[PDB]
Amino acid sequence: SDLIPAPPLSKVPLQQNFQDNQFHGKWYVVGVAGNGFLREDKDPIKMAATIYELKEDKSYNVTFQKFPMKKCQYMTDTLVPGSQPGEFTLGNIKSEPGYTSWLVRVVSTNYNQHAMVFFKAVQQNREDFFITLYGRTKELTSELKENFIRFSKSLGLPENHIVFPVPIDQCI
Ligand SMILES: COc1cc2c(c(OC)c1OC)-c1ccc(OC)c(=O)cc1[C@@H](NC(C)=O)CC2
Numbered sequence: 336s337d338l339i340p341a342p343p344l345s346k347v348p349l350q351q352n353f354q355d356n357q358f359h360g361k362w363y364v365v366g367v368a369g370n371g372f373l374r375e376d377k378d379p380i381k382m383a384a385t386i387y388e389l390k391e392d393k394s395y396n397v398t399f400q401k402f403p404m405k406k407c408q409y410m411t412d413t414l415v416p417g418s419q420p421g422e423f424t425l426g427n428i429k430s431e432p433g434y435t436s437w438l439v440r441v442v443s444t445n446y447n448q449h450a451m452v453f454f455k456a457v458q459q460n461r462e463d464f465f466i467t468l469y470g471r472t473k474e475l476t477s478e479l480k481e482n483f484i485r486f487s488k489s490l491g492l493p494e495n496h497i498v499f500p501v502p503i504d505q506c507i
Pocket of ligand 1: 400
């Protein structure tokens with residue numbers, strides 16, 4: 336299509352010894368890169384924080400601001416553990432107009448500062464993928480943001496498909 340193809344999974348690193356208990360909580364969206372994310376300097380965006388909640392069954396609740404981030408509205412999905420720690424499927428629980436599931440792979444995190452997470456659509460004829468740069472604070476370092484840009488570019492994403500929203504706590 337118009338879109339840059341998704342990488343094979345083997346090109347997406349997996350965070351080693353992923354600790355679900357240490358990943359839970361609030362994560363600001365500090366960066367988002369994907370074939371369907373488009374930097375428009377004329378239309379900057381702000382994004383509310385994502386909440387990852389670990390449950391008894393080791394799945395998460397995930398509460399996140401909805402795409403394409405025009406009116407701030409939260410949504411909640413289930414993050415079902417996959418083939419191993421760090422990996423999940425994010426499923427739309429009800430069949431609705433815009434519908435796909437995503438494979439979710441935590442690429443790297445140190446739990447208390449940053450995380451980088453890869454999302455790939457499991458729908459047959461969808462190249463759709465994106466990478467989220469999360470921070471525990473609204474601000475991350477230049478080195479951490481350049482590492483996210485380089486990772487994103489290594490999967491073929493142009494720099495104008497890499498967006499840095501203004502992180503906020505809540506919808507307004
Ligand atoms: C847990 O966090 C996120 C999870 C997803 C999305 C997203 O970006 C707003 C997130 O925040 C970083 C998401 C992303 C891109 C999409 O297409 C470009 C889409 O159609 C759809 C989405 C999401 N669906 C909706 C309705 O927002 C599902 C996956």
